[PDB]
Design a binder for these strands. Structure first.
Ligand SMILES: [Mg+2]
Ligand SMILES: [Mg+2]
Ligand SMILES: [Mg+2]
Ligand SMILES: [Mg+2]
Ligand SMILES: [Mg+2]
Ligand SMILES: [Mg+2]
Ligand SMILES: [Mg+2]
Ligand SMILES: [Mg+2]
Ligand SMILES: [Mg+2]
Ligand SMILES: [Mg+2]
Ligand SMILES: [Mg+2]
Ligand SMILES: [Mg+2]
Ligand SMILES: [Mg+2]
Ligand SMILES: [Mg+2]
Ligand SMILES: [Mg+2]
Ligand SMILES: [Mg+2]
Ligand SMILES: [Mg+2]
Ligand SMILES: [Mg+2]
Ligand SMILES: [Mg+2]
Ligand SMILES: [Mg+2]
Ligand SMILES: [Mg+2]
Ligand SMILES: [Mg+2]
Ligand SMILES: [Mg+2]
Ligand SMILES: [Mg+2]
Ligand SMILES: [Mg+2]
Ligand SMILES: [Mg+2]
Ligand SMILES: [Mg+2]
Ligand SMILES: [Mg+2]
Ligand SMILES: [Mg+2]
Ligand SMILES: [Mg+2]
Ligand SMILES: [Mg+2]
Ligand SMILES: [Mg+2]
Ligand SMILES: [Mg+2]
Ligand SMILES: [Mg+2]
Ligand SMILES: [Mg+2]
Ligand SMILES: [Mg+2]
Ligand SMILES: [Mg+2]
Ligand SMILES: [Mg+2]
Ligand SMILES: [Mg+2]
Ligand SMILES: [Mg+2]
Ligand SMILES: [Mg+2]
Ligand SMILES: [Mg+2]
Ligand SMILES: [Mg+2]
Ligand SMILES: [Mg+2]
Ligand SMILES: [Mg+2]
Ligand SMILES: [Mg+2]
Ligand SMILES: [Mg+2]
Ligand SMILES: [Mg+2]
Ligand SMILES: [Mg+2]
Ligand SMILES: [Mg+2]
Ligand SMILES: [Mg+2]
Ligand SMILES: [Mg+2]
Ligand SMILES: [Mg+2]
Ligand SMILES: [Mg+2]
Ligand SMILES: [Mg+2]
Ligand SMILES: [Mg+2]
Ligand SMILES: [Mg+2]
Ligand SMILES: [Mg+2]
Ligand SMILES: [Mg+2]
Ligand SMILES: [Mg+2]
Ligand SMILES: [Mg+2]
Ligand SMILES: [Mg+2]
Ligand SMILES: [Mg+2]
Ligand SMILES: [Mg+2]
Ligand SMILES: [Mg+2]
Ligand SMILES: [Mg+2]
Ligand SMILES: [Mg+2]
Ligand SMILES: [Mg+2]
Ligand SMILES: [Mg+2]
Ligand SMILES: [Mg+2]
Ligand SMILES: [Mg+2]
Ligand SMILES: [Mg+2]
Ligand SMILES: [Mg+2]
Ligand SMILES: [Mg+2]
Ligand SMILES: [Mg+2]
Ligand SMILES: [Mg+2]
Ligand SMILES: [Mg+2]
Ligand SMILES: [Mg+2]
Ligand SMILES: [Mg+2]
Ligand SMILES: [Mg+2]
Ligand SMILES: [Mg+2]
Ligand SMILES: [Mg+2]
Ligand SMILES: [Mg+2]
Ligand SMILES: [Mg+2]
Ligand SMILES: [Mg+2]
Ligand SMILES: [Mg+2]
Ligand SMILES: [Mg+2]
Ligand SMILES: [Mg+2]
Ligand SMILES: [Mg+2]
Ligand SMILES: [Mg+2]
Ligand SMILES: [Mg+2]
Ligand SMILES: [Mg+2]
Ligand SMILES: [Mg+2]
Ligand SMILES: [Mg+2]
Ligand SMILES: [Mg+2]
Ligand SMILES: [Mg+2]
Ligand SMILES: [Mg+2]
Ligand SMILES: [Mg+2]
Ligand SMILES: [Mg+2]
Ligand SMILES: [Mg+2]
Ligand SMILES: [Mg+2]
Ligand SMILES: [Mg+2]
Ligand SMILES: [Mg+2]
Ligand SMILES: [Mg+2]
Ligand SMILES: [Mg+2]
Ligand SMILES: [Mg+2]
Ligand SMILES: [Mg+2]
Ligand SMILES: [Mg+2]
Ligand SMILES: [Mg+2]
Ligand SMILES: [Mg+2]
Ligand SMILES: [Mg+2]
Ligand SMILES: [Mg+2]
Ligand SMILES: [Mg+2]
Ligand SMILES: [Mg+2]
Ligand SMILES: [Mg+2]
Ligand SMILES: [Mg+2]
Ligand SMILES: [Mg+2]
Ligand SMILES: [Mg+2]
Ligand SMILES: [Mg+2]
Ligand SMILES: [Mg+2]
Ligand SMILES: [Mg+2]
Ligand SMILES: [Mg+2]
Ligand SMILES: [Mg+2]
Ligand SMILES: [Mg+2]
Ligand SMILES: [Mg+2]
Ligand SMILES: [Mg+2]
Ligand SMILES: [Mg+2]
Ligand SMILES: [Mg+2]
Ligand SMILES: [Mg+2]
Ligand SMILES: [Mg+2]
Ligand SMILES: [Mg+2]
Ligand SMILES: [Mg+2]
Ligand SMILES: [Mg+2]
Ligand SMILES: [Mg+2]
Ligand SMILES: [Mg+2]
Ligand SMILES: [Mg+2]
Ligand SMILES: [Mg+2]
Ligand SMILES: [Mg+2]
Ligand SMILES: [Mg+2]
Ligand SMILES: [Mg+2]
Ligand SMILES: [Mg+2]
Ligand SMILES: [Mg+2]
Ligand SMILES: [Mg+2]
Ligand SMILES: [Mg+2]
Ligand SMILES: [Mg+2]
Ligand SMILES: [Mg+2]
Ligand SMILES: [Mg+2]
Ligand SMILES: [Mg+2]
Ligand SMILES: [Mg+2]
Ligand SMILES: [Mg+2]
Ligand SMILES: [Mg+2]
Ligand SMILES: [Mg+2]
Ligand SMILES: [Mg+2]
Ligand SMILES: [Mg+2]
Ligand SMILES: [Mg+2]
Ligand SMILES: [Mg+2]
Ligand SMILES: [Mg+2]
Ligand SMILES: [Mg+2]
Ligand SMILES: [Mg+2]
Ligand SMILES: [Mg+2]
Ligand SMILES: [Mg+2]
Ligand SMILES: [Mg+2]
Ligand SMILES: [Mg+2]
Ligand SMILES: [Mg+2]
Ligand SMILES: [Mg+2]
Ligand SMILES: [Mg+2]
Ligand SMILES: [Mg+2]
Ligand SMILES: [Mg+2]
Ligand SMILES: [Mg+2]
Ligand SMILES: [Mg+2]
Ligand SMILES: [Mg+2]
Ligand SMILES: [Mg+2]
Ligand SMILES: [Mg+2]
Ligand SMILES: [Mg+2]
Ligand SMILES: [Mg+2]
Ligand SMILES: [Mg+2]
Ligand SMILES: [Mg+2]
Ligand SMILES: [Mg+2]
Ligand SMILES: [Mg+2]
Ligand SMILES: [Mg+2]
Ligand SMILES: [Mg+2]
Ligand SMILES: [Mg+2]
Ligand SMILES: [Mg+2]
Ligand SMILES: [Mg+2]
Ligand SMILES: [Mg+2]
Ligand SMILES: [Mg+2]
Ligand SMILES: [Mg+2]
Ligand SMILES: [Mg+2]
Ligand SMILES: [Mg+2]
Ligand SMILES: [Mg+2]
Ligand SMILES: [Mg+2]
Ligand SMILES: [Mg+2]
Ligand SMILES: [Mg+2]
Ligand SMILES: [Mg+2]
Ligand SMILES: [Mg+2]
Ligand SMILES: [Mg+2]
Ligand SMILES: [Mg+2]
Ligand SMILES: [Mg+2]
Ligand SMILES: [Mg+2]
Ligand SMILES: [Mg+2]
Ligand SMILES: [Mg+2]
Ligand SMILES: [Mg+2]
Ligand SMILES: [Mg+2]
Ligand SMILES: [Mg+2]
Ligand SMILES: [Mg+2]
Ligand SMILES: [Mg+2]
Ligand SMILES: [Mg+2]
Ligand SMILES: [Mg+2]
Ligand SMILES: [Mg+2]
Ligand SMILES: [Mg+2]
Ligand SMILES: [Mg+2]
Ligand SMILES: [Mg+2]
Ligand SMILES: [Mg+2]
Ligand SMILES: [Mg+2]
Ligand SMILES: [Mg+2]
Ligand SMILES: [Mg+2]
Ligand SMILES: [Mg+2]
Lengths: 272, 47
RNA sequence: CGGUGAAAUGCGCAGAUACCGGGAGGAACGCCGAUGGCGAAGGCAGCCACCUGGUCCACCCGUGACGCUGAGGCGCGAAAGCG
RNA sequence: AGCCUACGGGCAGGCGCCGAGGGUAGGGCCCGUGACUGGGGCGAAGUCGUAACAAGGUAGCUGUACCGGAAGGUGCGGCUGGA
RNA sequence: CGCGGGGUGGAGCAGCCUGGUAGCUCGUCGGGCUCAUAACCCGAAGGUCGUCGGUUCAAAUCCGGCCCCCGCAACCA
RNA sequence: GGUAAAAAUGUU
RNA sequence: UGGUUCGUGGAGCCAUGGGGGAAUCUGGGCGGACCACCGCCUAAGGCUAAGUACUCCGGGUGACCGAUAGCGCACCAGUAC
RNA sequence: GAGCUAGCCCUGGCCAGGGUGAAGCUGGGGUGAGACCCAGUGGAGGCCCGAACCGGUGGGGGAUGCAAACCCCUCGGAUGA
RNA sequence: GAAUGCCGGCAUGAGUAACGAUAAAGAGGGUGAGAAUCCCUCUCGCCGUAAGCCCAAGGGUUCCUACGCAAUGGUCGUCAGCGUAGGGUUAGGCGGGACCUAAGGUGAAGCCGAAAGGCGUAGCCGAAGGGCAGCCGGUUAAUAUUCCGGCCCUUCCCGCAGGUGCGAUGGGGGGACGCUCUAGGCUAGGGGGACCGGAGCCAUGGACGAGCCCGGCCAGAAGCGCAGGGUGGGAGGUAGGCAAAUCCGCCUCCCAACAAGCUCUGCGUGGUGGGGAAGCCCGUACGGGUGACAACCCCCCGAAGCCAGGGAGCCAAGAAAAGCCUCUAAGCACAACCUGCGGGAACCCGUACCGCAAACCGACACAGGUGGGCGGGUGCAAGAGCACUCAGGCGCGCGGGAGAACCCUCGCCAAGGAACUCUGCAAGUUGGCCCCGUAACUUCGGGAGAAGGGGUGCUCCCUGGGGUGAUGAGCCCCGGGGAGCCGCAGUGAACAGGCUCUGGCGACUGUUUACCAAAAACACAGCUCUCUGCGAACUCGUAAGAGGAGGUAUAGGGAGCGACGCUUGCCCGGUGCCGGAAGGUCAAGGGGAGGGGUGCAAGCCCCGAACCGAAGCCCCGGUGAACGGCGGCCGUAACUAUAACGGUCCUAAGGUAGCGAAAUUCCUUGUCGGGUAAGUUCCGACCUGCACGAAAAGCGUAACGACCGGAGCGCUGUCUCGGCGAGGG
RNA sequence: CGAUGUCGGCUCGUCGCAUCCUGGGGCUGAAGAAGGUCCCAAGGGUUGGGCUGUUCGCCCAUUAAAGCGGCACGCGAGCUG
């Protein structure tokens, strides 16, 4: 339900803002186990490591329950759907009957005022968490743990979802958003349904400044440099790469695989 | 235009002060050379 | 092995074709099935449910000439094609 | 500040509005022309190929898309003006 | 003027390094097939190897000198 | 019938 | 691999980082690969004066200088700047 | 040595005054319901004119200078990267 | 005797350039050994969103006064920011600390590193941020929110008096937050006045007049008053807020739904306290008195400041901890805490002065640079703009003459208007507001201030809305119509677009070579390829660790291309990358056929071939929005000419679309066509493309540009071709 | 080479003659006018524009003519760039 703008200035005819109608009437945030101070920083102790980060708007870190075995069997009421600037996806405020207040990452189709519960019992309705060994084969799922009791680490960007393809012993087979088939242990929790805000792919930032609002400083091509700075640099005007294409550090960047070959996780991976 | 020397008591005493010399082994050798030479002021005079 | 009028390219001793067992995935629905049916046309074919339109018959009950066509307009509109 | 015949008047004159037209500027319509370029038509009996008419030697036609010196070829769906 | 490669039957190309014998495709000529042509089939002819010299028993072949052809180079102020 | 295929040209 | 005059050389000896891994006098190391004979030492624990080096400081001396020299400074100098 | 400069992190501050009038609300119109069309309201924008502020386009001056980058006229941005 | 030698001294240029903004000086009188330069008075000029006041940083005696002029002052100097000496900075309330936390720093635990050291949770440090209690006047030569005066507060600590279960660094609430536009009511500030209070003044033709001139305030407890900000009250039940809670949270029916009520600010009013002009008289550099028993009133404008944590909209989603309120834990309930009064106690540092500058940063009394607040009036539509001017501060620390060339900064010009020239470079023209009117093209926004026009001053009359006042006067903001007056000219001065046509490149705003390049370069949204399944890939680091990220394929990294539109053809032969449990080759190692050295021999020590031995390479495939590449020679058609067609050789494949003498074309000023009187440039074409071409992208494209080229109109000292005048030299 | 700043333009010139014109003359296939060619002659004169950075050159409109060369392809302590 993406917002379009009229071309009243340039860079608004293309500019595009997401729809906030799923955001219910909760524009400010909850507190005390809800935003911590978020440390802005482009760099480690000292030097820059991820180049071209900086600037951007100030943010507060909405602390999310990624490990929802804490409240097995305890139901919840969906009180709010909020904006998280730290994520592509939306967040859902839950009040527990137990009394706690936590954010789960808000799935698609989840509406306000809905009972939602985690555990092995946990009927297969959107938002509920279960082990993977209890979820039926073929259902789309998200917020998937990789190894059990370690936290939800898979399928949690906007609109992403993973799908169960089968079971094999203590492990189940998941089709990831990458298309990779992965053996994930059955005791790993996973929240059913896709993540939603699936129109996040269709946004157009419109102008250069909107990338600066996100903390994305401008990205300098290597061909516009000097050979001290980059392999592609140098040359009287516009050299055509002169070599197989490479990073500033020399490693090639067109097809060169760099997964560690002898990784012990490789015997749980079936596809690309 | 704007020249190089723009003074600050805070900056001068935290960069060139005695306690900043005694943190590093480099600044500890600085004062050692200044004791040995006979300097009247081991550190820049800050008030 | 494929393939043809005949061949060749191709696939194949790095273990193919042919066979069994398991898994994924998409598209189209055999027999019923036709000179059949439905729809205003384009067109519609496995099955289930929901939501929905047109139409045919009988009873001759009610309104009572409300009708027919239709320049524009509006809507539908195979396949190919475009985002 | 003039002239008068019946003068708290008239004439000449003066000011003003509209005003033919001329000037400046910008649009609209039409005609002639224009290096070059597209395709159309008729011409001397030219060159290259065989598309269509017989199952025209790949049934033909068709809308569209792509390609090819050229007719045309092929894909998708439709037609009997074919079996 | 510099460096490199080239000239061979009518057309286009081999053969030159490692001297002894010139081959391929199209074309031309003669004969078939056709009513006639093209296509196709069977035969056949054709080359002072750009020239001028010298090396050798012997030169398309090796070496030089000229005549043409193709490509590169012709910079610094 | 729901059921298979063969290589140019000809002045007016 | 380092140390020794020894740069892989016939390369021992002395230390070692890695792997294997003993023996207690009929035990063990060395005498420049190695083997035999003849000899010298007794590792894998530690301490140990003196002779030796230096001159911030004190003294003596000079075929050392004499204010552009001799220390950067004979003078309130590691100062002013 | 980041008291100049380049980038970023934390925390404060600054941007006179005019224009243009997007979305959206309200009302009318339209329809079977819509889309949509008018008005009024509304005040969006790396929007427009232009001071402070940040710059440094063209020319002249300056050239042992006022100045080891200056001065005058002119010019770009000026709610945003 | 030389080394552009070193150090020092003194010459030359030379009484030459210069004396540091062209804001500006003149006279009288003092003082003095000595005055353009010091003091005083009068006149003149300059700033006045400052060149005037108040803070912060920095500076550190420069402040005040007395005595002085050797040097410092670009001259002089009796003066001074200078020399000698003396004086001067007064705080519970301002600022900082005995309070808190941010980035970051440090760091018991813990991890790491040859050593030195590097990380690192809690904690601690860390400030223009949060918190917190003083306003107005008067005094000194020099200090005051600091001393004094009046009014008002905050902490502690000890007492009695009355209340309550008190009680932690622990739990919870709160603190607590964006940007932009804004409502209502006040305040700051300002304007006007027939009203009130004033020394005085009628000048030169006129005026004794509601005349001129000056001034009509400030703070202020409780108490009210007006605006406004915050917040629901019970009852149970309760597993969560890492022990406990009556608190918070979550459910559940009851009553409120309002700011009714509690509080909390702001602004008025308030016991009372203070200030109080012009002008005149004086004795000082600086002030003092009178004016005055001062008056101390009414309207209007009105904020960007206050009520503040107000409201609305939007996406980019907008600090932390303490103080504060409450809750319970040990412990304690003779304690303790809350409220009211009384007495006592209230420490350390800074306080002078300069502060857009002669006291800071620039070697200088340097035309430079430097953060926050106040910054009045009138007119110009508005305004912090521009011109003049209050308060206040200055005339820039060499002057006097002259009136050449020449230079700088200005002004004007006959006739011509770009003939100047690399180029209209420069300078002119245009210029603000109101009203008409406005093209191709287009992404429907634009282009648009298109272009091109008209009006603009002053007086008189009539008349329509508002705001504050009560519905009225007045005061203020906006209008309409009519009639006249003057001048060469009415945004009468100052501030204030020249315009159009057409191409090249880049889409656009933006960024860059501080100090010769602001551009077509970089960036940019957007497109594609590729890597990355999370202890991710990548980066920094020996490591630990950290970034990525407190992210998870709609995410992160790398590379190119660079909005958008239509598109992005063929070659996997070589290079790269990807995929291949075959085979060839291949190191240490395993292996020992066999041989050697010594021993009397057991033995001890060397070499050592088959064979088993990874990655890598060879090999087989794939892959272009991966590195890259995309042919030659002949002949041929009803006139030549050309070649749709053919032959042949080679390649991995032989440049398709679209453009093309172009930012690309050597020959070249190619050849036609247009603009011109005349066009090596420009535009439209042809294609013979030396040497375009599809993501080092191809062809286009509205809007946009201090980019680059061509043309035209307007206007002009650019020129013909100069001349005159001004000011600083 | 411990520095001799280079094309072109502007400004200012000066010099040479093998002369573009004007002046004098011989020959002419010189009727006349207008030319051709050669000899004497430098005293003076030798235009304004379009294109290009141009020197040169080609055009436009004229003229008595639209001369060639030297002076560091004269001249940057004179200027432009
Ligand atoms: Mg809390
Ligand atoms: Mg750190
Ligand atoms: Mg550090
Ligand atoms: Mg880039
Ligand atoms: Mg570069
Ligand atoms: Mg570097
Ligand atoms: Mg490199
Ligand atoms: Mg190039
Ligand atoms: Mg390169
Ligand atoms: Mg600092
Ligand atoms: Mg009936
Ligand atoms: Mg259709
Ligand atoms: Mg379709
Ligand atoms: Mg599609
Ligand atoms: Mg009468
Ligand atoms: Mg056919
Ligand atoms: Mg046919
Ligand atoms: Mg056919
Ligand atoms: Mg085809
Ligand atoms: Mg078909
Ligand atoms: Mg049939
Ligand atoms: Mg050949
Ligand atoms: Mg040959
Ligand atoms: Mg024959
Ligand atoms: Mg024949
Ligand atoms: Mg060179
Ligand atoms: Mg070179
Ligand atoms: Mg060159
Ligand atoms: Mg034919
Ligand atoms: Mg060694
Ligand atoms: Mg050794
Ligand atoms: Mg050696
Ligand atoms: Mg050795
Ligand atoms: Mg060892
Ligand atoms: Mg040993
Ligand atoms: Mg040994
Ligand atoms: Mg030995
Ligand atoms: Mg031995
Ligand atoms: Mg021996
Ligand atoms: Mg021994
Ligand atoms: Mg021992
Ligand atoms: Mg010794
Ligand atoms: Mg001594
Ligand atoms: Mg000395
Ligand atoms: Mg002496
Ligand atoms: Mg000395
Ligand atoms: Mg900095
Ligand atoms: Mg300001
Ligand atoms: Mg505005
Ligand atoms: Mg509207
Ligand atoms: Mg606005
Ligand atoms: Mg703007
Ligand atoms: Mg602009
Ligand atoms: Mg502007
Ligand atoms: Mg600045
Ligand atoms: Mg800059
Ligand atoms: Mg400038
Ligand atoms: Mg300049
Ligand atoms: Mg200035
Ligand atoms: Mg502008
Ligand atoms: Mg000497
Ligand atoms: Mg000297
Ligand atoms: Mg002298
Ligand atoms: Mg003199
Ligand atoms: Mg003099
Ligand atoms: Mg002189
Ligand atoms: Mg002189
Ligand atoms: Mg002088
Ligand atoms: Mg001076
Ligand atoms: Mg001066
Ligand atoms: Mg006297
Ligand atoms: Mg003035
Ligand atoms: Mg301070
Ligand atoms: Mg200070
Ligand atoms: Mg100083
Ligand atoms: Mg002093
Ligand atoms: Mg004195
Ligand atoms: Mg003096
Ligand atoms: Mg003295
Ligand atoms: Mg003096
Ligand atoms: Mg005196
Ligand atoms: Mg003083
Ligand atoms: Mg003094
Ligand atoms: Mg204390
Ligand atoms: Mg104390
Ligand atoms: Mg503090
Ligand atoms: Mg503290
Ligand atoms: Mg602290
Ligand atoms: Mg820390
Ligand atoms: Mg240690
Ligand atoms: Mg540390
Ligand atoms: Mg503070
Ligand atoms: Mg504070
Ligand atoms: Mg305070
Ligand atoms: Mg004072
Ligand atoms: Mg005071
Ligand atoms: Mg007091
Ligand atoms: Mg209590
Ligand atoms: Mg707390
Ligand atoms: Mg007041
Ligand atoms: Mg007032
Ligand atoms: Mg009175
Ligand atoms: Mg009089
Ligand atoms: Mg008043
Ligand atoms: Mg309640
Ligand atoms: Mg509890
Ligand atoms: Mg209310
Ligand atoms: Mg009051
Ligand atoms: Mg009060
Ligand atoms: Mg008084
Ligand atoms: Mg006075
Ligand atoms: Mg609010
Ligand atoms: Mg907090
Ligand atoms: Mg704390
Ligand atoms: Mg509270
Ligand atoms: Mg003070
Ligand atoms: Mg003070
Ligand atoms: Mg200031
Ligand atoms: Mg300086
Ligand atoms: Mg001076
Ligand atoms: Mg100074
Ligand atoms: Mg000074
Ligand atoms: Mg001065
Ligand atoms: Mg100054
Ligand atoms: Mg400033
Ligand atoms: Mg004001
Ligand atoms: Mg003003
Ligand atoms: Mg005004
Ligand atoms: Mg006026
Ligand atoms: Mg104005
Ligand atoms: Mg203001
Ligand atoms: Mg001003
Ligand atoms: Mg004054
Ligand atoms: Mg005049
Ligand atoms: Mg004139
Ligand atoms: Mg005139
Ligand atoms: Mg004109
Ligand atoms: Mg011209
Ligand atoms: Mg000219
Ligand atoms: Mg031009
Ligand atoms: Mg100009
Ligand atoms: Mg004018
Ligand atoms: Mg245009
Ligand atoms: Mg418009
Ligand atoms: Mg206009
Ligand atoms: Mg235009
Ligand atoms: Mg007037
Ligand atoms: Mg009012
Ligand atoms: Mg009212
Ligand atoms: Mg008029
Ligand atoms: Mg103006
Ligand atoms: Mg232009
Ligand atoms: Mg061009
Ligand atoms: Mg641009
Ligand atoms: Mg620069
Ligand atoms: Mg430089
Ligand atoms: Mg520049
Ligand atoms: Mg620019
Ligand atoms: Mg694109
Ligand atoms: Mg690091
Ligand atoms: Mg590393
Ligand atoms: Mg990490
Ligand atoms: Mg993170
Ligand atoms: Mg990615
Ligand atoms: Mg990326
Ligand atoms: Mg580019
Ligand atoms: Mg278009
Ligand atoms: Mg291949
Ligand atoms: Mg290839
Ligand atoms: Mg390849
Ligand atoms: Mg491979
Ligand atoms: Mg071996
Ligand atoms: Mg071996
Ligand atoms: Mg062995
Ligand atoms: Mg291998
Ligand atoms: Mg391509
Ligand atoms: Mg012919
Ligand atoms: Mg061919
Ligand atoms: Mg092709
Ligand atoms: Mg041309
Ligand atoms: Mg032409
Ligand atoms: Mg022409
Ligand atoms: Mg052209
Ligand atoms: Mg062409
Ligand atoms: Mg080219
Ligand atoms: Mg290109
Ligand atoms: Mg190319
Ligand atoms: Mg490409
Ligand atoms: Mg491009
Ligand atoms: Mg183009
Ligand atoms: Mg383009
Ligand atoms: Mg364009
Ligand atoms: Mg520009
Ligand atoms: Mg720009
Ligand atoms: Mg022209
Ligand atoms: Mg002039
Ligand atoms: Mg003059
Ligand atoms: Mg003058
Ligand atoms: Mg030289
Ligand atoms: Mg020399
Ligand atoms: Mg010399
Ligand atoms: Mg002569
Ligand atoms: Mg003559
Ligand atoms: Mg003659
Ligand atoms: Mg004659
Ligand atoms: Mg004659
Ligand atoms: Mg030109
Ligand atoms: Mg030349
Ligand atoms: Mg000459
Ligand atoms: Mg020459
Ligand atoms: Mg020259
Ligand atoms: Mg020069
Ligand atoms: Mg020159
Ligand atoms: Mg010269
Ligand atoms: Mg010279
Ligand atoms: Mg140049
Ligand atoms: Mg230039």
């Amino acid at each position: 339900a993406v917002k379009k703008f009229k071309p009243y200035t340039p860079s608004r005819r293309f500019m595009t803002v997401a729809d906030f109608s799923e955001i219910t009437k909760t524009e400010p945030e909850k507190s005390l186990v809800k935003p911590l101070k978020k440390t802005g920083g482009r760099n480690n102790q000292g030097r820059i490591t991820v180049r071209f980060r900086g600037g951007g708007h100030k943010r507060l870190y909405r602390i999310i329950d990624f490990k929802r075995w804490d409240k097995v069997g305890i139901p919840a009421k969906v009180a709010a759907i909020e904006y998280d600037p730290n994520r592509s996806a939306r967040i859902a405020l839950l009040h527990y009957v137990d009394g706690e207040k936590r954010y789960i990452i808000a799935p698609d189709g989840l509406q306000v005022g809905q009972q939602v519960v985690a555990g092995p019992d946990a009927p297969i309705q959107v938002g509920n968490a279960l082990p993977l060994r209890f979820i039926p084969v073929g259902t789309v799922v998200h917020a998937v743990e990789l190894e059990p009791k370690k936290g939800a680490k898979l399928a949690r960007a906007a609109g992403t979802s993973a799908q169960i393809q089968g079971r094999e012993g203590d492990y189940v087979i998941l089709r990831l958003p990458s298309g990779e088939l992965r053996k994930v242990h059955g005791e790993c929790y996973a929240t059913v349904g896709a993540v939603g805000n699936a129109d996040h792919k269709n946004i157009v930032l419109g102008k250069a400044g909107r990338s600066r609002w996100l903390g994305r400083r401008p990205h300098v091509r290597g061909a516009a440099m000097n050979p001290v700075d980059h392999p592609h640099g140098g040359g009287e005007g516009r050299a055509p790469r002169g070599r197989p294409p490479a990073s500033p550090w020399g490693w090639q960047t067109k097809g060169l695989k760099t997964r560690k070959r002898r990784k012990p996780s490789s015997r749980f991976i079936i596809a690309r | 235009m704007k020249r190089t020397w723009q003074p600050n008591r805070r900056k001068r005493a935290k960069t060139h002060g005695f306690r900043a010399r005694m943190r590093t082994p480099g600044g500890r050798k600085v004062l050692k050379r200044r004791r040995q030479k006979g300097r009247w002021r081991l550190t820049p005079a800050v008030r």
